[PDB]
Write a protein that binds this ligand. Structure first.
Ligand SMILES: C[C@@H]1CC(=O)N(C)N=C1c1ccc(NC(=O)N2Cc3cccnc3C2)cc1
Ligand SMILES: C[C@@H]1CC(=O)N(C)N=C1c1ccc(NC(=O)N2Cc3cccnc3C2)cc1
Lengths: 467, 467
C-alpha cells in the first residue's frame, strides 16, 4: 500500500489551487440531514487509522513510484515531490495531522460533526484534503452499522409485542453477504459493522478484523450453526431429497441445523417429507438443537406465511402469553432470500396479522445487509470549514443556490450535550465560550500516532437500543 | 490471507452433507436469464486466481488458526482438519482444482456458462464449493464492466446522431467513485473494470492492479486532468470566487482544467464570472487545453440545459453538419453529480431535444459507476450441475416450484458458436458430440498453477463495441 496513490487524481493538483500563504486547512465529516435514518452509529475510523495512516507511511521508494505513475497519468509533472520529501525528512514519514472524533459505537442524530481533520505543520496545509478519499470510506462501516441497528429496532418491537421478551434478538438477523460484496476487504469491514448490533454471521472475514483492530473479552464476536446449500441436497439426485434431509439432520443431531427445503418444491418438503416421512427425527430433537427449515424462493412474505400454516397443521402448535402461535421448540424457520430493511418490516407485520410469534423465525440477509448501500443513504460528506491565510483565520463553506441540503458548516466545529441531553454542533469556534460545557470529540490521531482506541465490547455497549 | 477462513461458515460443515462415496463435484457460474442487461463482459477471474488461489495456500499454521477459530465460532469441532492436511501432504498445499473459463473481455448473452470448477482428486470432492464464496465475488468486476459498457453504447449512439463521429468517446465517462466505494480493494477492482471500456479515471488504485495482474503495452491504462474541489474555491472566501477561478485557470493555462462553479450560484458563475469578468482568459485558451465548467448540484438534466443556454449566449456558438449546437473548442461542460446509467440516458436525450451536440459534455460518475450495483442485477450465480457417486455420474440441478427463473443447468457444460454466430451452452455432456465447434472454455487454473492469462490490451479488444 502507498498512501501517495490512495487519493482522487485531481487532489494531486490541489496544492497549486489554494490561496498562497495558507498555513491551515481544517475539514470535517458529517451525515448531512435531509428535507428515514435520523441517527447514525459511528464505527470504522479506527480500522483506517491503524491499517493506512499510522507510523512511517512515506518512503523514498513510494515518492518515486508515485512521481513515475503521475507523470504518465497526467502526461505532465504536477506531483508535489518537495511537499512529500518534507514529510519524509522532518517527521520520518509520519503524517503531521490531528484527527478528533466522537467515540465509536456512539449514536448521533444527522447533521452533527463526527470527526475533524487538520494539519499540525504550516508546510502541510495540502495534506488535510489529500486524505479525504481514504477517510470518507468511513461511510461504509457507518452505513452498514446504522442500517443493521434500524433492522434490530424493527425485530425488537415485534418480538416484544408477540412474545413479551427479547430472548434471541441478537441472533435473529444473520449475515449471509460474503459472496454478495465487492471484495474480501469489504466483506471483513461489512461483517464487523453488522456484529456491532448482532452475534450471528457466516462472513468469517469479520472475525479476524475485530480481533486485530478492536478486540473482545470473548474469544470470537460472532457465531454460526451447521447448514445445507442446494449442492448438498441436489447432489443426492432429484428422487432422493428425503435421503439427503435424513443424512444431514442425523449427522448434526445434537446441534441446531438449517436445511434449505425449496430445491424442487418447498410446500411438499414441509408437508410430506418433514411433516410425515421424517417427522419422527424432528420431534425427538432437543430445545438446544432444533431443525430450522429454510425457504429460498418465491414472494418472501407469502412463502413464510404458507410454510408456517403447513407446519402448524403437522406439528403441535402452542399459544404464548400474548395470544400468538408458537411451533414446538425443536422446529424453527429462517427466510434467507430477498431480505432488506423493507421486506423485513413487511414479513414481521404480516406474521403479526396472522397471529404467528416472531419467536418462530430468524432472517438471513446478504446483499441487503452488506452491498445494497451507498454514500448517498446518510449523505456521508467531508468539507473544509476553516483555513488560515496570511495569518488570518476565515470561516469557509459551500451554499449551492439549487440545493440548500448541500450547505456546509462554518469555521472550527465542536460537539456538545444540550441541557435536555441531546447533541448540538457549534460553528464559528463558539465552543470556546464554554456555554455548552466540554467538546465531546477526542483526539484519536496526531503526528502519525493513534492516541485513543475502543474495544469492540465498548462499541457494542455504546450502540445498545433504548428499550 | 488464509483461504481456510475465506468461505461462508456453513460450507465448513458441507463435507459431512454430500452423498457418501462422492469422488467428483462439478459446479458452474452463469449470469442467469430473466422473465435490461442482455450481454455481460467477463472480467475479474484472473485477479482472484493470482491473488488468492494459486501456489501454496495451505500451511500447518493456517490449518491450526482455522481449527482454533471454528472451534469457538461453532462451539463444536466440525472443521475438516483431515481433508486440509491431505492437501498439505499430497500437493504441498496446492489446490487440486481445474477451472475452465471463457476468455476475459468476451461479451456473452445472459444464461451461458462463463466458468466451470471441479476437483482433480477424488478425496477433494468438498473443495469445489468451498471456493464458491471467493469465485462468486467475480460478480463485481463483471457487473461494473457490463454497466460501464452499456453506458458507452448510449454515449456512442447520441454522439453519432448529433456529431456524426465517436471522437473522444473513450474519455466521456470519467470514474469519480474512489470515496464512494466500500474499501481500497473494491476501489482497485471497480476502477479496473471501468477501464475495460474507457480511458478516463480519478480512482488511482485501478492503475496498479492492471499493471500487476493484467499489463498494458501503453505505460498506464488510464488518464486524468487538473480539477478543483469546493475546498480549493471556498478557501478564498465567499466574496473571492472570481479570484479563485482566475488563479486556477492561470496555473493550468496549457492543459485542460475542470473548475467546480456551483459553490454559491452556478448560474451567476457561468453568466457573470466566466461569461463577463474572466471571459478574456477563456477565449484565449488552446483547443488542447479547454476550460471545463462543472455543475455539482440541482436536477442534473435541468442544470445542464440551463448552463448550456447561459454559455451559448455569452460565447460564439456554431451549428455542426447535423444541425446541433457546439460551444467553441476552448469551452466544455462535465456533469459529475447524480450520474447513473438512467440519468446519463435522461441528459443526452434532453440535450438532443434542445439541439445541443453530445460533443459539448462529458460525465463524472462515482457511486452510480462503482457502488450502486448488486449480485442481483445480472443474477450472477454458482451451482453444482454434475457429481460422480459410487463411480456413476449424475446430472443434478435445482428447480424451485414458485420461481422457474432460479432453475439451474444439468450435467457437464460446454460453450459453443451457433451456425449464425451466436453462443449456446450444451448440457448433459452433449458437447462431447462434435455437432458444434470447439468448446470456447479454456483451462485457466489446474493443481495450484494459472495455465492461461490475458493482457489488459486483449481484454479491451474483446470488449469493443461493434460499429
Ligand atoms: C442459529 C440461528 C438462530 C435462530 O434462531 N434461527 C431460527 N436460525 C439460525 C440460523 C439459521 C440458518 C443459518 N444459516 C444458513 O441458513 N445459511 C448460511 C448461509 C450463508 C450464506 C448463504 N446461505 C446460507 C445458509 C444460520 C443461523
Ligand atoms: C478531460 C475530460 C475529457 C472531456 O472531454 N471533458 C469534457 N472533461 C474531462 C474531465 C472533466 C473533469 C475531470 N475531473 C473532475 O471534474 N473531477 C475529479 C473528481 C474526482 C472525484 C470527485 N470529483 C472530481 C472532480 C476530469 C476530466
Amino acid at each position: 500500500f502507498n498512501i501517495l496513490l490512495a487519493t482522487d487524481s485531481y487532489k494531486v493538483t490541489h496544492y497549486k489551487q489554494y490561496p498562497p500563504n495558507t498555513s491551515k486547512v481544517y475539514s470535517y465529516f458529517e451525515c448531512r440531514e435531509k428535507k428515514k435514518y435520523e441517527e447514525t452509529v459511528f464505527y470504522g475510523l479506527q480500522y483506517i487509522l491503524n491499517k493506512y495512516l499510522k507510523g512511517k507511511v512515506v518512503t523514498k521508494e513510494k515518492i518515486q513510484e508515485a512521481k513515475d505513475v503521475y507523470k504518465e497519468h497526467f502526461q505532465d509533472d504536477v506531483f508535489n515531490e518537495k511537499g512529500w520529501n518534507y514529510i519524509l525528512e522532518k517527521y520520518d514519514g509520519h503524517l503531521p495531522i490531528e484527527i478528533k472524533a466522537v467515540p465509536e459505537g456512539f449514536v448521533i442524530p444527522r447533521g452533527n460533526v463526527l470527526f475533524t481533520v487538520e494539519n499540525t505543520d504550516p508546510e502541510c496545509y495540502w495534506l488535510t484534503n489529500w486524505i479525504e478519499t481514504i477517510l470518507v470510506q468511513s461511510w461504509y462501516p457507518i452505513t452498514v452499522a446504522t442500517n443493521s441497528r434500524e433492522q434490530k429496532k424493527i425485530l425488537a418491537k415485534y418480538l416484544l409485542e408477540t412474545s413479551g421478551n427479547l430472548d434471541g434478538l441478537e441472533y435473529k438477523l444473520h449475515d449471509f453477504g460474503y459472496r454478495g460484496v465487492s471484495s474480501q476487504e469489504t466483506a471483513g469491514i461489512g461483517a464487523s459493522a453488522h456484529l456491532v448490533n448482532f452475534k450471528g454471521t457466516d462472513t468469517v472475514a469479520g472475525l479476524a478484523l475485530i480481533k486485530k483492530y478492536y478486540g473482545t473479552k470473548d474469544p470470537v464476536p460472532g457465531y454460526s450453526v451447521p447448514a445445507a446449500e442446494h449442492s448438498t441436497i441436489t447432489a443426492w439426485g432429484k428422487d432422493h431429497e428425503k435421503d439427503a434431509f435424513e443424512h444431514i439432520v442425523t449427522q448434526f443431531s445434537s446441534v441446531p441445523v438449517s436445511v434449505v427445503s425449496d430445491s424442487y418444491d418447498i410446500y411438499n418438503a414441509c408437508e410430506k417429507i418433514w411433516g410425515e416421512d421424517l417427522r419422527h427425527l424432528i420431534v425427538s430433537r432437543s430445545t438446544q438443537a432444533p431443525l430450522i427449515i429454510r425457504p429460498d424462493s418465491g414472494n418472501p412474505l407469502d412463502t413464510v406465511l404458507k410454510v408456517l400454516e403447513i407446519l402448524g397443521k403437522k406439528f403441535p402448535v402452542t399459544e404464548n402469553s400474548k395470544g400468538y402461535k408458537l411451533l414446538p421448540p425443536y422446529l424453527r424457520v429462517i427466510q434467507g432470500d430477498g431480505v432488506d430493511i423493507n421486506t423485513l418490516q413487511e414479513i414481521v407485520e404480516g406474521m403479526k396479522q396472522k397471529m404467528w410469534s416472531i419467536e418462530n423465525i430468524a432472517f438471513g440477509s446478504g446483499g441487503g445487509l452488506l452491498q445494497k448501500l451507498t454514500r448517498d443513504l446518510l449523505n456521508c460528506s467531508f468539507k473544509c470549514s476553516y483555513v488560515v491565510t496570511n495569518g488570518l483565520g476565515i470561516n469557509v463553506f459551500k451554499d449551492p443556490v439549487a440545493d440548500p441540503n448541500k450547505r456546509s458548516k462554518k469555521g472550527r466545529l465542536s460537539l456538545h450535550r444540550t441541557p435536555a441531553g441531546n447533541f448540538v454542533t457549534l460553528e464559528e469556534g463558539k465552543g470556546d465560550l464554554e456555554e455548552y460545557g466540554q467538546d465531546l470529540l477526542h483526539t484519536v490521531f496526531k503526528n502519525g500516532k493513534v492516541t485513543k482506541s475502543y474495544s469492540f465490547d465498548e462499541i457494542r455497549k455504546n450502540a445498545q437500543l433504548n428499550i
